[PDB]
């Protein structure tokens, strides 16, 4: 077992007070942060708006990098 658990570092609550603590913390706990269906959509990405000199190395290290990074 290698999960990181909640620790009551001080105090010794009764099982009712444990239940109250858990129901509060569990309903306070954040919802679906970092959502599972964050689609990719590169339409109009800011890197395509920039002017690049025809020989600008940022055409490799910014533009192509940004399109191809997955």
């Amino acid at each position: 077992d290698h999960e990181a658990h909640i620790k009551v570092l001080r105090g010794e609550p009764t099982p009712e007070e444990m239940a109250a603590l858990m129901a509060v913390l569990a309903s306070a706990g954040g919802g679906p942060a970092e959502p599972v269906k964050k689609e990719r959509n590169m339409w109009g990405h800011p890197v395509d708006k920039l002017r690049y000199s025809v020989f600008s190395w940022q055409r490799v290290t910014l533009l192509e990098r940004t399109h191809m990074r997955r």
Binding site: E3, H5, I6, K7, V8, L9, G11, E12, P13, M18, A19, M22, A23, A26, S27, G29, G30, G31
Partner: peptide
Amino acid sequence: VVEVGGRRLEVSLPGDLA
């Protein structure tokens, strides 16, 4: 799983309470 001074205490809740 919750620990009280390091004593293990398995707790169970419904899968959502938010």
